[model samples]
Target: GRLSGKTILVTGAASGIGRAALDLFAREGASLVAVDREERLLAEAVAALEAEAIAVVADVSDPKAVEAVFAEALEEFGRLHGVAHFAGVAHSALPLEAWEKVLRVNLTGSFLVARKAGEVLEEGGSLVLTGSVAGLGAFGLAHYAAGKLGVVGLARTLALELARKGVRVNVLLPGLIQTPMTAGLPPWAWEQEVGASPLGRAGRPEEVAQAALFLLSEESAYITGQALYVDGGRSIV
Candidate 1:
């Protein structure tokens, strides 16, 4: 129960990394506040968690909606201790429209969510953004690369700005993870892609969640303004 008695707010809690992180945080004994745009799926997520997880359905891109979500969390939970910003959309390698969507959700949405989190999170809290391996290097992804890279920059700057408040901001850069987000890719694509990492296999949601948990925990108090790669050594090669 590393997070015992703490309140954590996680966005994009309906699926993928966000959902995984939510489960882990709950298991660690934290009162959870979850948010997502998908109402039905989010409800299912809450139902799965035996604990009464609070779910707020809202579009992260809208400042007003984000404000409402925060207000709801405060009213229900009293205070927030940490936030894991995981709401985002991906895009194909090509297509400008898809690229625009990626930038809006992945980059702009992150800013909006973190801004709201920073405003209310008490001292000793943390803010962890879902960055990607693409941010660290070129991955033939123009829009995603740009957006993910923007998150890293945001984390670093936020760390500095929020340091005096005893709050930490960091990024979790994940490589290829076997989740709903990457489920549509062909098997052959994974082999070629995973070779970049020494493990030669895609990561799992729990693995990423474990790293995220560490960042959100008080154990990482001395660590801030950094990007921790849960990429199975992908960046080394």
Candidate 2:
């Protein structure tokens, strides 16, 4: 019960890493406010939670929607203790439309959510942003790389800006995690990426969620403005 009596806001809660985090946080005694653009999937995820949690259907890229989500969180829980912004989109090839959309969801969305979190996060609250190994560098993932890298910069700045308020901000850089986001990759592509990892396999959503949980919990009280890699040493080689 590391997070006992705390309430957290988690974006991208419908699936992938966000979904896994929701389950783990609930088990750790954290109430949750889950947000996602997918209404059906968001509902299903919320319904499966064992803790007191609420769901907000929203596109994090929308400022108004994000503000509304924050308002609802305060209304339901009275105070917000942490945030896990796992909402994102991935794209390659640099197609204009795809690139813009990727930036919108991954970069813009992260900013909106983090900004809102900064405004209302309780003292000693924590915020975790999901970046990727691609952000460090990857082929054909120009758009995704840029957007995720932007997220890193955003978090770092927020870490400093919010320090006076006793709020901590950090980023999580995951390698090839096995989630719906990576399910679309071809077998060969998956093998190559997995092989690059010292662990020789893709990471699980729950694995990243564990790292995120630590960052969001009091165990990381002194950790801030840091990028914790749950990438199985993929970034090393």
Candidate 3:
């Protein structure tokens, strides 16, 4: 119960790392304000949580909707202790339109959430932004890599900007995690990727969720403006 009695908001809670973090937070005794655009799936997600979860259907890229979710957090919890910006779209290098979509959701969405969370989070609270290893290395994913790297820069800058308020901001750069987002990937794709990683495998959402829990808890009180690699040593070699 590292997060006992805390209230946190997890964006993109319909599935993947967001869902894993949501479940882990609940298990640790934290009240949740979950948001995602998929209404039906969101409902099913909350139903499966088996706890009191306030699910909001909204697009994180839209500033108005991002604001609304923050307002909901304040309305429900009166104070926000943690925020994990996990809502984002993946990229396939398809075209400029696809790149813009990724940037809008992944980078801009993070900015909006962190800005709003800064307004409501109590002192010593934590803010986690989701990044990707694609941002750190040349992975042939230009659009996604750019957006994720932007997240890192944003988190570091905010960590400095929000220091006075004791609000720590950090980014998570996960590598090849198994999620609904990658469910459609061809088998050969996974094989090639796994071979590149030193670990010879992809990571799990729970693994990243555990790292996030640490960041949200007092255990990481002295840490800020850092990019944590939860990529099973893949980022190293």
Candidate 4:
């Protein structure tokens, strides 16, 4: 129970990496504030947690909604210890509208959540943002890449700004993880991309969750402004 008595906020908690992180954090003795746009799934997730966890249904990109999430966390837990921001979107060859939507959700939403979290986090508190190897580079992913790379820049800068306050900020660069978001990929596309990994496989959401947990825990006290890749060496090649 590395996180015993801690209270953490996790975004995109309905599914994928976010869901897995919530479950793991709860098991580690942390109370939770879980958020997602999917109401049904979010409720189910909250119901399944053994710890004191509350679910908030909201669009992460909306300022009021983001504010409400933190307000709820403060009300429920009275304070914050950590935040894991896993909300994001992915698309290829999107129209301008779709492109804007992706940026708004992935980039702007991250800023909103991180900024709010920074305001509430206590000294020694931490924030973990989800990025991707796609952010590092990939064809046909201009919009998604831009947003995720922006996440890295945001976290790095925030780490410096929050340093004096002892609030650490870091980003997770996951590559080819098996999540609901990647479930729609064509079989060939999946194999080709995942096979490129030195591990020769896609990662599990729980695996990425483990990396994120470290960042959120006191174990990463000296770690900040870092982009830890939970990519099974995919970014290497």
Candidate 5:
């Protein structure tokens, strides 16, 4: 019940770590705005939830969509407490367009969300952005690593910029989580990831969600401007 009486917006709420976070947040008595680009799945995700939540389908990479999402959240909730942004593309692209898409949604999307959150979050608010262990070290997916690493820097600056308002910003680095996003990878790739982890296995989405809960709640009030890794030690090894 750490989030009781608090309200937040959770992007990528249709599935994966984001969905898990929404479920956990609601259980702890937090009202949330759920967002995802996948309209149908997003609908299904929230359809029967007993939590106080609303679903919004919007592409984080689009400026208009981002603005509209915030507008909708404010209109519905009246006041904002925080945002947990996990909306991003998981697949790599061969064409230049695909590469740009990763950065656009991961890096640019974080920028847009943080920009708006900075403007609207109440004093003592928190914002958690998604990064990755790949961002901490080399990976074949150069575009993903680049954008996620950029996310870390962005969160740090945001933490400093919003400190005056008592707002906090932090980035989460999850490594090879077992979610739909990673289910598409071939077996060999999955094996390689598991082998690379010091924990010798991929982590669960719910595990990352628990970490996110800590970051978003007053439990981490003194914590900001850092990357909290929930990657089963993949980041260290």
Candidate 6:
């Protein structure tokens, strides 16, 4: 187990890429801190873990909630080894409130978590922030793209700042993953975004989870301030 004896906190743990990371990271020998806004699903996820795990219900966008989850992690695990933040919202055409919500959760939420994690992370620990290929510009979801691109900025600067502290910060740019977030899209949507891939498919959450684990592991110790694409070559085309 690559992560034996370590504790990794995964946000948005109820579904999608976060859910994938929960099972995958735990199997790699991490005691899990599963955070999600979905109460029932979060409970179920923890119950099914079988390994050492805890679940927290909170909105990632809320400062107090973020603070609370970290406090709980410290109480349960004593220290933090890694954090994979995957809590965000996406909408095709959002109005003012939704736009603000996306910005708050995607960008501001990253800020809060990164700063907090920066303070608590043990030496050699890693922080993997979720970015989207849309941020690298293949689509036009303005608010979402802006927030994700903002994440890259934050993570890069955080990597630089946290380097002396022995903490690595990196972003994962995922493209067209088969998560609940993209469940009802028309075939054209998938084709438009992922057409260039030879296999012609959206990636699975487990694949993205593997990429996240790579960043979270000691294998990525010298790989800070980088953005790794787990898009199955979607961004290349």
Q: Which candidate ranks first by lDDT, i.e. highest? A: 2
Alpha-carbon RMSD of each model: 3.1, 3.2, 3.0, 3.2, 3.1, 3.2
Model 5 scores a TM of 0.90
lDDT of 1 by residue, 166-225 (tens): 889988878778787576777777677787778867888889889989999999998997
Model 1 stretches astray by more than 4 angstroms: 88-96, 134-149
lDDT of 5 by residue, 1-237 (tens): 889999889988886788888888998999989998899989988876778889998988788998999999999989998899877423321166876667665777888988988999989899988866642345533533344447776888889899999999988878778887666677987887788888888788899888888988998999888877777777554
User: Candidate 6's error at 48, in angstroms?
Assistant: 0.9
In model 1, the Cα lDDT at residue 219 comes to 91
Per-residue CA lDDT of candidate 3, range 1-237, in tens?
A: 788888889988877788888888998888899898899988888878855579999888789998888888788778889998777433321266866677665777777888988878889999998866632344633533344447776887899899999999988878778886687878887777777677778888899899999999999999998878776666564
The C-alpha local distance difference test score for the whole of candidate 1 amounts to 0.79
Q: Report lDDT (CA) for all predictions.
A: 0.79, 0.83, 0.79, 0.81, 0.80, 0.80
Which whole-number lDDT from 0 to 100 does residue 64 have in model 5?
Answer: 96
TM-score of each: 0.90, 0.90, 0.90, 0.90, 0.90, 0.88
lDDT of 5 at 181: 62
- The digit string of per-residue lDDT tens for model 6 on 193-212 reads 67755467778889989998
lDDT assessment of candidate 5: 0.80
Total backbone collisions for each predicted model: 0, 0, 0, 0, 0, 0
Distance (Å) between predicted and true CA of 27, model 2?
0.7
Error of 4 at 105 (Å): 2.8
Model 2: per-residue Cα lDDT over 62-181, one tens digit each: 899999999999999999999998874333212568666776667778788889899999799999987667423455335333434476678888998999999999988787788875
